[PDB]
A and B are shown apart, each in its own frame.
With several copies, the nearest count.
Chain A
Amino acid sequence: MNTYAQESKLRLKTKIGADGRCVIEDNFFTPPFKLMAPFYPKDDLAEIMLLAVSPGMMRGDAQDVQLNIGPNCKLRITSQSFEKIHNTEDGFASRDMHIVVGENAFLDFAPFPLIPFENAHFKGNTTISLRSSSQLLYSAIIVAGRVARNELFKFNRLHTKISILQDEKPIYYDNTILDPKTTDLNNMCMFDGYTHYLNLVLVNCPIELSGVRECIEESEGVDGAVSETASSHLCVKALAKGSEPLLHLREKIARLVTQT
C-alpha cells in the first residue's frame, strides 16, 4: 500500500571524475529520495547526503536503495537528519539497501540515528558487497524512542538485518530484533536502562583494536566495547543515554581511520 505515486527507489553510482574528485556517474531517484551534487570539504572525503524528502517512514513505505561506489573513491555517505519511523497502524515501513564497493574504495556510511515512534514497525535489510581491497565503515544507531517525552520501547517491532560479504564470501552477519511485546528490552542484557545503541563495523580499516579501545574508553558517557569478528574485522557495540556521546564516538573512530 505505497502512498507514493511510484516506487521509492534510489540508484546511485559514483566514480572518480576527470579532475580527480569523486563525482556521481549516474543517479536515479524517485520520491521521497533525492540526490544533490557531492560536497567536497577541504580535507575530508567526498560527502554525499542521501536526502529524504519526508517527515519519516510511514505505513506502506518501501524504499529500495542501491549504492555503487567505484574504484579509488573516498566517499562518506550521510543523511539529512534523524530517520524517524512513524506509527504504522497495520502495515510496516521497509528499507532494502544494497551497497557495492569497488577495488581500493573507502565508504564511510554514517547515517543519523533511527528514532522509532510509538507502534512503529520497521524492516531494514542492508547487503554490502566488498572487494578484497575495499574499505568499509558501516554504522547504525537505534534509539529507544522519543526519550525526552517518556516514549520508551513503545514501537511495534524493529527488524534490522546486515549482511557484509567480501569477495562474494560472507564475512559479517547481524540480526537486530527489538520486539517489546515479546520481551522487556529494558532488562539487564538488552539495554540495561540505556536508550541509544550504536553498532559499528570496520572492514579492512587500518586501525588497531588497541586504538579503538582507547577511543571507546576515553569517550565519556558511553558503555561500549570493541572486538574482532571471525573474518578479522572490527565490531564496536556501544550504549548511551543520549545520541550525542554515540555520534561523538563514531566521528572519533572515523577520524582515527581516516587520519591513517
Chain B
Amino acid sequence: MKLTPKELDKLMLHYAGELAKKRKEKGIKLNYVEAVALISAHIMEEARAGKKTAAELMQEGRTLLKPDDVMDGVASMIHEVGIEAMFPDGTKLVTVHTPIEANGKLVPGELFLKNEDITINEGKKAVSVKVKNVGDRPVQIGSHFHFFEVNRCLDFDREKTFGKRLDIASGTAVRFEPGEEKSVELIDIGGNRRIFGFNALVDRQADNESKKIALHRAKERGFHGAKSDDNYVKTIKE
C-alpha cells in the first residue's frame, strides 16, 4: 500500500480529528487545535464517502461545532479551515469560512482602535478627472500606477493626469467597467518623480518638458485622450 508523505500527513490529521471528536463526546470544550482538526477530519471523511459535493461540504462544515462546544476565543481565532479532500473526481480544496460563531467573551489578539480617521496623502491637493472605459473589459488601476500610462482603452484628458496617481488607500484599486464613466481623484506622484516602467511612455523624470514627449508617444501608440500637436518638434533624445 504505497503511502505518500501527503497520505501520512492526512492520516495524522484524521487521527487528531478523531481525538478531538472523542474529547467532544466526553464533553471537554474543544480548543483551537481540536476544533480545526475536527472540522478538517469530518470534511475528509465526507469527501471519501463521496455522497456530497464540495459546495455541500463547505455548507456542512459550518454546522459541526456549536459555540458552546469550544473554549472562549476559539471561534475568534478560527477564520477559515481549508482542507484538500480526495473526491470521486480528484482532489479538491474545501474551504469552510467562520465555522464557529463567536461568543464575544474573549478575543485573543483583539484590536482596540482609536475612533479617529486616518488622513492619507496629507498635504497633497487632488484634481478630478472623468474617465470612460471604451474597451470591452473592466480595467483595474492600482493606487500607485502612473495614471497617464493606464490602458489605452480608457478615455480621459491624459495631459491633466501626467505625473499623477489615484488618491486612494495604497494597495486598493479602482475598477472601470466597460462603457462606464467614472470621476477619479488624482494626486502628484511624490519622491523624485522619476517614472520608469509602466507603458514606457515617460521612462525619465516627470516634468513639463517630458510631458510633451510623453504626450507625443501616447498619441503615436494610440492612447485615448492623448492630444499632441500635429507639428511636434523632436528632441535629440526621445
Which residues from chain A sit less than 8 Å from chain B, CB to CB?
A: 6, 17-21, 23-24, 26-31, 35-37, 42, 81-82, 84, 115, 143, 145-149, 151, 242-244
Contact = CB atoms under 8 A, between A and B. Distances in A.
Interface in B20-68: 53, 55-56, 58-59, 62-63, 67
B53 A6 contact: yes
B181 A242 contact: yes
Contact of B101 (A23, A145, A243): A23
A37 B79 contact: yes
Size band of the B side of the interface?
20 to 34
Nearest to B180: A243
A153 to B, nearest CB: 12
B138 to A, nearest CB: 7
Nearest to B102: A19
B157 interface: no
For the complex of A and B, 9 pairs with smallest distance between CB atoms: A146-B179, A19-B104, A148-B132, A28-B59, A82-B177, A148-B179, A37-B98, A18-B103, A149-B134
B179 A151 contact: yes
B205 interface: no
Interface of B: 53, 55-56, 58-59, 62-63, 67, 79-80, 97-98, 101-104, 115, 132-136, 138, 155, 175, 177-183
A256 B155 CA distance: 34
Given A20-B104, A143-B179, 8 more contacts: A18-B104, A26-B62, A28-B56, A29-B58, A81-B138, A115-B177, A145-B179, A243-B181
Contact of A148 (B67, B97, B104, B181): B181
A251 B53 CA distance: 39
Contacts of B53: 6, 30
